[PDB]
Amino acid sequence: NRNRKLSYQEYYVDGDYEEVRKKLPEIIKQARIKASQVMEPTIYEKRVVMEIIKDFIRDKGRKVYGGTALNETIKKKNPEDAIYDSYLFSDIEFYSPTPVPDLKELCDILYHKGYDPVQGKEAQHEETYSIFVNLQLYCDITYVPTKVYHGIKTIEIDGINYTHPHFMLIDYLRMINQPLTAAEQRWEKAFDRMYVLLKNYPMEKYDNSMRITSPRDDIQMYIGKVKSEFMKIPEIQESCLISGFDAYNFFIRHAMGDRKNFITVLPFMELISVKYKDTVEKLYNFLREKVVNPDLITIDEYFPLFQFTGYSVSINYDGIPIVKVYEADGYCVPDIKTTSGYRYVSYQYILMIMYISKFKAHLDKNKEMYFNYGIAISNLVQARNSYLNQKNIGVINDTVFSEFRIGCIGTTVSYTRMSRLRMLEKKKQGKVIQFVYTPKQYFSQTPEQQNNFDESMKKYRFKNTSGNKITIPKNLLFKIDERGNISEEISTEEAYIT
Amino acid sequence: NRNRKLSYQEYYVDGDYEEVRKKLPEIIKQARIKASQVMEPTIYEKRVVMEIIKDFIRDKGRKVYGGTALNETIKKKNPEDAIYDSYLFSDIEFYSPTPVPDLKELCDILYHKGYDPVQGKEAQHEETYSIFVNLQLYCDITYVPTKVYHGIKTIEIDGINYTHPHFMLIDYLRMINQPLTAAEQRWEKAFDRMYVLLKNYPMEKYDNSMRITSPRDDIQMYIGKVKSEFMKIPEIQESCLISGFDAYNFFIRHAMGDRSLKNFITVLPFMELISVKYKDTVEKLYNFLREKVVNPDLITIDEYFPLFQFTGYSVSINYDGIPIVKVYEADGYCVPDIKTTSGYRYVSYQYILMIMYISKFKAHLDKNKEMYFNYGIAISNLVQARNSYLNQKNIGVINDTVFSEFRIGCIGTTVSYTRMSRLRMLEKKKQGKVIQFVYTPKQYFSQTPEQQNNFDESMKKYRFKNTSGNKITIPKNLLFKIDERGNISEEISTEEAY
C-alpha cells in the first residue's frame, strides 16, 4: 500500500559495469592527452621548460629519483614496461648536496630566459624545494648530505644520472614497512612499482659464503647474554625487535627446519627500539653488571643516516661492539612474536635492513661488510623462495615469510597529524612556515639587498643525517659521568650540518 | 660502460601479482581498522565528535550531500549496496543558507564541550567551510542561496535530511560533462557512484505527453531564423552549442531514424544555446534579431543570475514580450559537443540529460507546474529513446554514435582546477583580501566584548556571489547595456551581486 502507480526504466543492465570498467582507462588517457594539447600551459610549452631543467641536471651531474628515474631505468630494459606515456607530463625529482643554491641558479636561468611567474618554494616534505613556472610544478630538489650523495649509485641515460632501481627499492620497502601510516594511500602503488622494478632489475644470486670474523670469546659470551637474558625482560620484549644478523639467522633457520652454510656467526647483536632512550639505559646497565671489568664499557653514538635510520648507539666492551641499538620512536615496527616472548623484525623489514646496511658499508668503503650484506640479501631471497615452494603457499600467507604484514609494535600517528603538529611547532618558534625565492623580486632589488639575501641563504642549516659518529658533547643523547653512569641529556639541541 | 654478466633469482613468479592484487584490499581495510583503534584521534573519539555534528544537523534541518547522503539513501533501499562500511570514519558534508553562522555555532558548541584545538576554515573551494577538531576534518558546510536551498528535495533517515539521489545525480553528470578537467581524478569514481545510485533509484517512466504551447507565428519564424541563419555563421558554430528542446528533438530524431516514438518530438517554445564566448554571442544575436525583425524597437533582453553551481549567467532575447532565444554562459569550460555535417553543434547526450535535470529543478523553484512536468517527460523520453536505440543497434553504452557516454570531444578554452585555484589566490592576494577565513572560538572568547561584536557584525557584512537564478532587476548588475537608440554594449561594473 506504498505507491503502486510507479514505473521505472533500466539505464544500466548487468554487463554494462564490466564494459565501462575495461574501456574507461583508455578513454581517461585520451582525455588527459587532449587536455595537454589545448590547455595552458600546453605540452609544447611544458617540454621547452623541462628541457632547460634537464640541461641544468645534466650540467651539474644531479641524481634523478622517483617516477622519472624508475620510468627511464625500466624503459632502458623493456620499453613496454614504462609507467609514463612520455606525452603525459610528469615533474622531475632530483637529489642535491646544495638544494637552495641549485634552486636559485635554476630559477635565475628560467627568469633570464623570459619566463614569468618563476618561483622556487619549500615543499611539504622539509629539505625538498619545488620550482613553479607559470603556476605549474616542474621539479623537486631534495637535500642529501655530501658523503651520502656521492655514494648514491646511478645509471647514466642520455647524459642524466638516474638513481639505481635497487637504491629506489629501499623507498618502496619503507612504505611496505609502515603498515598503519602508509597502507591506505601507498601499498597498491608501491607493489605495482616494486613488481615492474624487480621484473626488469631482478634480485641477484650470489654463490659465495659470508666471511664474518668470530668475535673474542668474552664478546661472544656477552652477545649471548644480550639474547638469552636481556631479551627475556618483559619491558624489553614489548619495546624491542631483534634485527641485523640474528634476525637473518632466524629466517634461515625457519627455511631449513631440519628435514645450513647460510647461517652466520653473530659479530654483534642489533636491536630496533620504539622506546630508544629507555632501551639504551637498561642495556648499558645490564652489560655493566654481567661484564668482567665494567670500566671497559663505552658508548659510541651515531647521527641518523639519510631517510633510512634514526639515531643509533654501539655499546662496546674494551673497544669491541657487543650490541647496536636503533631509534624507531614514533613508528609502529612490523614484528614476529615468538613463543619465547621476544620479537624479530618482519621478513620485508629485515630485507630493507640488509639493503640499508649494504649501502652504509659502501659509504664506509668496508669491502668485507659490503660483500657480507650482499650475500645475506641473496641468501634471504633464496631461503624465502625455497620455503614458499616447499610449503606450497603464496607470497601472502600465515607464516614468518609472508609479505604485506600489518602486525606491528610501537605508538604512531598519521602523516597528516604529524604534518599539522610540525606546522604548529614552526608557528610557535617564530620560524618561516614556507621559504620562497622569486628571481623577479631579487633582480629588482639593489646590490646591497641582493647581497643581504645571498648571506641569508648561506646561514641556513639542514638536520644532520650524515650517519657519522657524534663527537660534540652537546649533540650526544646519552651522558656518561666520571662514575660511569648513564643518564639522558634533557637539554639536547638538534644537530645541524654543514 | 659494459653491463656485467651476473646471476639472478626469482622474486615474483606467475601469478603472484594476481594473488597480491586480490588480497590487498582486505589487508588495507584491516590496517585502517587497527590504525583507528591505536592512533590519535581514535574511532571512539571520532564517533563522539561526529554525534555532536549530527545533533546540530538534525536540530537545524540541514541537508546532507555527497558520500554520506549517497551511502545512507542507498542503504535504506538495499544494505548490500553500501559504498563504504559505517564502522570506519567518513567526514560529513551539508548544505546551508547561513554557512558562516552555522560554522561559528558548531565551533562554539565543540569549544564549550572541552575540545581543543577547534577551528572553522574556508575550504579550497570558495563558499565551502570545514570544521577541524584536534587537527582532524569532520564536516564541510556549503552555501546555498535561501530560495535554492528550500527547493532541494530530501529523504529523511533517522531525523536527518539527505539530498535526494536524483538531485545528487546532477553533480556526477557535471563531472562526466567536464572531460578535460575531471576525467583523470573523477570519472572512474563518478561512474561507480552513478551505477549504484540508478540501480537503487532508477530513472522513472512517464506515460504522459508534453504540453508546450506553440509560439505566435512571427516568434516561430524568428525561432526558425536563429537555427536556419544565425547557427550558420562560422564564428557562431565554433563558440555555440544548441541545447534545450531543439537538442532534445535531435536525440529523438536519431533514435527513430525517420525510417523512440514520433509523439516524443515537441514543438519548440524558443531556441536555447550554450556559449563559450557569452558576451560576443549575446551581442551578435541581439544584432541579428534587430535586423530580421519587423519593428526592432519591440526587442528586449531579460538577464538572469547564475543558478547555484549548475548554470552561469543567462539572457532571454524577447520580441513584444515573447522569448525567441535563451543564451547560457559557459566561458572557461570545454563543453561536450556533437558536430553535424551542417557545421552547427549540439550538446552531447549526457550533457542534454544534465540540462533537462537542471531545467526541471529551475521549473520547481519557479513554481512553473507546466514546465516542471514537461522537463520530467523529456527526461523519461530521452532515457527511452537511448534504450530503444542501443537495443536495436545491439551496442554497448560507450560506442561511436550520438548516444555514446564518456565522450571527450568538446569546444571552448579551459584550464585545470589547480591552475584556476592558483590564479584565484593571486587575485585575492593583489586585492588585499583575506586568503583563508579562519574562525577559532578559543581566540574569540579570549577577545574583548567590542572585538567579539566587531566579528559578529563582519559576519553580516559578508556577501556570497548571487547564484539565486533570479532575473536581474538592478541596472548596475546587468552585463548588457541597451541605450536610448536600442544598441547593445557590454557593461563595465566591478562589484555588487543582488
Numbering used by the authors:
A (entry chain B): 4 to 262, 278 to 516
B (entry chain A): 4 to 262, 276 to 514
Publication text:
We verified that the Mimivirus and M. chilensis predicted PAPs were able to perform polyadenylation. These proteins were not only active, but also intrinsically self-processive, generating >700 nucleotides long polyA tails. To elucidate the molecular basis of this processivity we determined the Mimivirus and M. chilensis PAP crystallographic 3D structures, which revealed two topologically identical subdomains with a nucleotidyltransferase fold. Thus, while other PAPs form heterodimers with processivity factors, the Mimivirus and M. chilensis PAP become processive upon homodimerization.
Since they shared the same characteristic features, we will refer to the highest resolution structure of Mg561. As observed in solution (see later), the Mg561 crystal structure reveals a very stable homodimer with an almost perfect two-fold symmetry axis (179°) and a 3200 Å2 buried surface area upon dimerization. The dimer structure highlights a large tunnel at the interface between the two monomers. The N-terminal domain (D1) encompasses an extended strand followed by a long helix (α1) bent at the P28 residue. In each monomer, this helix creates a domain swap, and makes contact with the D4 loop located between α13 and β16 and the α7 helix of the D2 domains of the other monomer to form the dimer structure. The third domain (D3) of the Mg561 structure surprisingly mimics the catalytic domain topology leading to an internal symmetry between the D2 and D3 domains (rotation of 162°, 2.4 Å translation and Cα-rmsd > 2.0 Å). Two of the three catalytic residues (F286, E288, K342) are replaced by non-canonical residues in D3, and an even longer insertion within the helix-turn motif (37 amino-acids) of the NT-like subdomain is present. The interaction with the D3 domain is stabilized by a conserved disulfide bridge (C350-C426) connecting the beginning of the β14 strand and the β16 strand in the D4 domain. Electrostatic potential calculations highlight intensely positively charged grooves on each side of the entrance of the central tunnel, which is contributed mostly by the positively charged D4 domains and to a lesser extent by the D2, D3 domains. RNAs could therefore interact with the PAP through the positively charged grooves and reach the catalytic site through the 10 Å diameter wide central tunnel making the two catalytic sites accessible for a ssRNA molecule.
